């Protein structure tokens, strides 16, 4: 029986503490949604490892989740260990219901804790307390009345971890009513204890003692546990999570990492609420297949079998001197075949013989006495050891021997070999002396001719096949590896593996170590063959060295992840994008499927769609092509509606799955070439927008020493030893700081002096109500200013962050005076005119202030004052709806949160690099300072300084680039401030999308917001037009407008609003006659 661990198994990792923190870590955890074995009882013949025991002993496996349920206190302790017997150490932890006693005692084997003795028995479990090595007492780990006073059922979740000799133990207690299976809902497991044990735990079993049941009708033997209390078991696996800590500091919730692609996004982007968007996550190139591959063909050979099988060897004294080279060797047959009587190798391992290489190999072979065999070795003394062939005390290959009483010995007697007694030139090792040493001086008292006149040191050595050792001829050949003297020449039999096709293989062609996929290529290498290349070691093409076919080697051939999520708050489905993999290769490590059972992860779904950038595993390609959304690559995007064909679908396309159409930037809105008939404004819209520019960043400074050293004088010594980097760094940060102040001054302080917000605000129906600062409400930030200062993430994720060396000097202009500047800008903008920057500000009423700002797009003051009422009310409505969208859309201000988050990341990663040892024996400073002597300290710490310095350097540079681009933005900002707050610019699509009216500064935490109020026309209409009228034999041409016809009467109108007029002299300019011109018409002038 299997049940899912829906949410259990989570415990606070270490006694560390945090508050409202989304911390993450990887410890041995019970995976989410895992099948667990519902042990209940004997379930007769349901026991496989134990006998008459309900729930047999099980493997430990480095961690188990445990939980026992009951309606009354029943379940006893546990047994941990490897043998659970006196043989090998094991652990026992029992609940006495009066106290808990923890013992590692080696108890005798009890097949059951409850041998039948049902309850009157006295602790049957304690078979023997021999070698009790540990003991401890504490308050019981108790259970019930939860189970009956509440009449619920009670719980105790447990985790028995053996981590580094420390046996961490956790617990909780909880009522339950739905007694059938483990419920949903969340919890945690605080520990109780650590135990420095150090035992090896491989098996463990639960303990329960049958007091008295009634399962069987015996009235005493009724004690039975087939239908009694039960418990589940899981196993913990090394998976990381992301925790969610409480205000009080509790584990409120937790999320997986390898369960879903979705959870893996969560843990990439540390949060519980991701928004719609592709999140490059963790790439997965390949696991290469087996091994080296060359071929089974051409190779060469030394004639070893020539000389070894040569059944005629020579005198030991007249030992052969044979040099062999320029081949391929093989020492397998000699070393393994039973031909030799003796195999013994001196400073050369017989195993590695083939893979070694030698310039020259010498074979010195002969026949030896059986008893003399011992004297061929470095460090041997004797007649032959001194006077026939002497080994030196150095690297000699081997000393081989094999009897040849069959071949060397003959029954007719064989005296043919020899052994000189004691009388040649003493044999500096390797001297082939063969001289006839009859006399020495013919007079010497030792040998001479006096005393000895019938001696000859050569003593020919008779023998016979059946004569005995000593008279036993052993054939001996020695392989003299002459090596390293020159280029190596002799190596064993390599080129020994078949080649492979079209699968990621770690290949080696004649020393070319690499990994790739082999393919049939189509060029021809010249005998300069051996390999090809594209650039600078890209050994892209290669041929086999042994049969001469050429091949291509393309890379390990691919991996990818680009998970798509439409947003947790509004869906929970996920589909994975694989960057550039023809998922014929079933993308992940082809068909990874060694992972958690998860159809996206278990990527085989029929819902697939290959594109330029690989394929989507959760893919439902359509051909209908809406507007783009979360972008995939090369056009294609996602995110249609909930109801394309089926109701079960969500705005996440094809709910629980995802489609990917091809981007279609919209529809078509063409007109065709007109004859001359214009489509021209009859009605329109004045409207409004937004824009958000960062204009600064939060100031920062970093005392270089304190960041690096932080009061460790030796660090300060070495840091002043590295020249003046610190000065440069501090200076650059100071420069960008004062630069920030300059930007603020340039953006806001353009005007010379404040003109107050007029007390009586009665602006021509153009209600503000929202832009001018608070009437007298606190801080004098305007209502829109208020929401700008509040809807901005007031957390900022919580930068309120100076710990060591960090600091923040505050800005110069403060938000009160900044808002004062802004308000002044407003006041000049509205009362003065476009002149509160060109000298002393003048004054003009707002009706004219916008009539001659209409005149800035080509419409006179009849237009407004004729429609001053409705145009004004449109302004009020539009600017009110500003409040709406600025108040409503989440991520509306994304630019300034982007900036502040960027600096947040910068500093946060900076201190995290602070916590890194960069090759040092530790990351923290004072211990490595104080754990070692002077020299090794200073060198390792110096490694730390250099790493810290480079990190700080990267931060400073990155800040410089960010600062410069913000400078450009700020210059643009003040430029806009000037062109369309101190005037009305015309550079198209700079002061708002459309014909511009005006711009309104609004403060910001670090940026600025404009309100580009633009003129976007509407309601086009078609009429007849003519570039001239020939009147009185004479063409006409318009001064202030154009001639338009209704089809029957001609009318004079302007170019961005239909305002027709009669044809009159004073608006029409008159030259030549009807010239060579197209479109001229009748119906002449008054």
């Amino acid at each position, epitope marked *: 029986a299997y049940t899912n661990s829906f949410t259990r198994g989570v415990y606070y990792p270490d006694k560390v503490f945090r508050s409202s923190v989304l911390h993450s870590t990887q410890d041995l955890f019970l995976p989410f949604f895992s099948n667990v074995t519902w042990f209940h009882a004997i379930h007769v013949s349901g026991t496989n490892g134990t006998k008459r025991f309900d729930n047999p002993v099980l493997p430990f496996n480095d961690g188990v989740y445990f939980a026992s349920t009951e309606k009354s206190n029943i379940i006893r302790g546990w047994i941990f260990g490897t043998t659970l017997d006196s043989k090998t150490q094991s652990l026992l932890i029992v609940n006495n219901a009066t106290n808990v006693v923890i013992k590692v005692c080696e108890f005798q084997f009890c097949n059951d804790p409850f041998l039948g003795s049902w309850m009157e028995s006295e602790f049957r479990v304690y078979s023997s307390a021999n070698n009790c090595t540990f003991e401890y007492v504490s308050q019981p780990f108790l259970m019930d009345l939860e189970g009956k006073q509440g009449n619920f059922k009670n719980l105790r979740e447990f985790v028995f971890k053996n981590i580094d000799g420390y046996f961490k133990i956790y617990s909780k207690h909880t009522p339950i009513n739905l007694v059938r299976d483990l419920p949903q809902g969340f919890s945690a497991l605080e520990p109780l204890v650590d135990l420095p044990i150090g035992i090896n735990i491989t098996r463990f079993q639960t303990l329960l003692a049958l007091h008295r049941s009634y399962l069987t009708p015996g009235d005493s033997s009724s004690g039975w546990t087939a239908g009694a209390a039960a418990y589940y078991v899981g196993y913990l696996q090394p998976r990381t999570f992301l925790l969610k800590y409480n205000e009080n500091g509790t584990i409120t919730d937790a999320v997986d990492c390898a369960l879903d692609p979705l959870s893996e996004t969560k843990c990439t982007l540390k949060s519980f609420t991701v928004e719609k968007g592709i999140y490059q996550t963790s790439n997965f190139r390949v696991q290469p297949t087996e091994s080296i591959v060359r071929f089974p063909n051409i190779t060469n050979l030394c004639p070893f079998g020539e000389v070894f099988n040569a059944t005629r060897f020579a005198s030991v004294y007249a030992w052969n001197r044979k040099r062999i080279s320029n081949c391929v060797a093989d020492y397998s047959v000699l070393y393994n075949s039973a031909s030799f009587s003796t195999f013994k190798c001196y400073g050369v391992s017989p195993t590695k013989l083939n893979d070694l290489c030698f310039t020259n190999v010498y074979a010195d072979s002969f026949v030896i006495r059986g008893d003399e065999v011992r004297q061929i070795a470095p460090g041997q003394t004797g007649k032959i050891a001194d006077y026939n062939y002497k080994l030196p005390d150095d690297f000699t290959g081997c000393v081989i021997a094999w009897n040849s009483n069959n071949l060397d010995s003959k029954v007719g007697g064989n005296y043919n070999y020899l052994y000189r007694l004691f009388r040649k030139s003493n044999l500096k090792p390797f001297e082939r002396d063969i001289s*006839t040493e009859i006399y020495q001086a013919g007079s010497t008292p030792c040998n001479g001719v006096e005393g000895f006149n019938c001696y000859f040191p050569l003593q*020919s050595y008779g023998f016979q096949p059946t004569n005995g050792v000593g008279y036993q001829p052993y054939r001996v050949v020695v392989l003299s590896f002459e090596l390293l003297h020159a280029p190596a020449t002799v190596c064993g039999p390599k080129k020994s593996t078949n080649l492979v096709k079209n699968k990621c293989v770690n290949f080696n062609f004649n020393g070319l170590t690499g990994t790739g996929v082999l393919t049939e290529s189509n060029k021809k290498f010249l005998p300069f063959q051996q390999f090809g290349r594209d650039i600078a070691d890209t050994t892209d093409a290669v041929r086999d060295p042994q049969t001469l076919e050429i091949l291509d080697i393309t890379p390990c051939s691919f991996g990818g992840v680009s998970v798509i999520t439409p947003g947790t708050n509004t869906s929970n489905q996920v589909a994975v994008l694989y960057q550039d993999v023809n998922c014929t290769e079933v993308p992940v490590a082809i068909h990874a499927d060694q992972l958690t059972p998860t159809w996206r992860v278990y990527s085989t779904g029929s819902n697939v769609f290959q594109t330029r950038a690989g394929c989507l595993i959760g893919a439902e390609h359509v051909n209908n092509s809406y507007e783009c959304d979360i972008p995939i690559g090369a056009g294609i995007c996602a995110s249609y509606q909930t109801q394309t064909n089926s109701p079960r679908r969500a705005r996440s396309v094809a709910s629980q799955s995802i489609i990917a159409y091809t981007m279609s930037l919209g529809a078509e809105n063409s007109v065709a070439y007109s004859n001359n008939s214009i489509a021209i404004p009859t009605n329109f819209t004045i409207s409004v927008t937004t824009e958000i520019l960062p204009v600064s960043m939060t100031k920062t400074s970093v005392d270089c020493t304190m960041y690096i050293c932080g009061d460790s004088t030796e660090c300060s010594n070495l840091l002043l030893q590295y020249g003046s980097f610190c000065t440069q760094l501090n200076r650059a940060l100071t420069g960008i700081a004062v630069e920030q102040d300059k930007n603020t001054q340039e953006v806001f302080a353009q005007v010379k002096q404040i003109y107050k917000t007029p007390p009586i605000k009665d602006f021509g129906g153009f209600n503000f109500s929202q832009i001018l600062p608070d009437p007298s409400k606190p801080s004098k930030r305007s209502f829109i200013e208020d929401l700008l200062f509040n809807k901005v993430t007031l957390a900022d994720a919580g930068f309120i962050q100076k710990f060591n060396g960090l600091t923040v000097l505050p800005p110069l202009l403060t938000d009160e005076m900044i808002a004062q500047y802004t308000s002044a800008l407003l006041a000049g903008t509205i009362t003065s005119g476009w002149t509160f920057g060109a000298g002393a500000a003048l004054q003009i009423p707002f009706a004219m202030q916008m009539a001659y700002r209409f005149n800035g797009i080509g419409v006179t003051q009849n237009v407004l004052y004729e429609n001053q009422k409705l145009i004004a009310n449109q302004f009020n409505s539009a600017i009110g709806k500003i409040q709406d969208s600025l108040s409503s859309t989440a991520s509306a201000l994304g630019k300034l949160q982007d900036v502040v988050n960027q600096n947040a990341q910068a500093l946060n990663t900076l201190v995290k690099q602070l916590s890194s040892n960069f090759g040092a024996i530790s990351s923290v400073l004072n211990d490595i300072l104080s754990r070692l002597d002077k020299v090794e300290a200073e060198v390792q710490i110096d490694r730390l300084i250099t790493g810290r310095l480079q990190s700080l350097q990267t931060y400073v540079t990155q800040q410089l680039i960010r600062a410069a681009e913000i400078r450009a933005s700020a210059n643009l900002a003040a430029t806009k401030m000037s062109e369309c707050v101190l005037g009305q610019s015309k550079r198209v699509d700079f002061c708002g999308k459309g014909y511009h009216l005006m711009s309104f500064p609004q403060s910001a935490p670090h940026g600025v917001v404009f309100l580009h109020v633009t003129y976007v026309p509407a309601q086009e209409k078609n009429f007849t037009t003519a570039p001239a009228i020939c009147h009185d034999g004479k063409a006409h041409f318009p001064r202030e407008g154009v001639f338009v016809s209704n089809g029957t009467h001609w009318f004079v109108t302007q170019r961005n609003f239909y305002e027709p007029q009669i044809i009159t002299t004073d608006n029409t300019f008159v030259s030549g006659n009807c010239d060579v011109v197209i479109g001229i018409v009748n119906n002449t002038v008054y």
Partner: nanobody
Amino acid sequence: EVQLVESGGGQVETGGSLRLSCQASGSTFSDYVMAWFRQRPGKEREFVATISRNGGTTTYGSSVKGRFTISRDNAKSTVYLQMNSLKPEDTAVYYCYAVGGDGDSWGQGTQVTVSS
């Protein structure tokens, strides 16, 4: 080319003289030192006389050495052996036995039967 073919040996009376020779199969003869041995039937090989690489250095055995005469002849590709003051105890198959290169060097085996 060391196919040493013993030559010159033949039946001899007790006290006579004969030439003994041997030839490698068309090679150098200086460096290949010859040795000559006696193997009476009813026993095995023994040694009477030999020579050096020079050939001038007529190093015979330790037994009576004025018996035999030796000469390596590089100009005629054969050794030359003149045995003299003979005794019937040399009825044996001799071997020219050019030491250089192959030590146990022979391949014809020259018979010298010492008659009555």
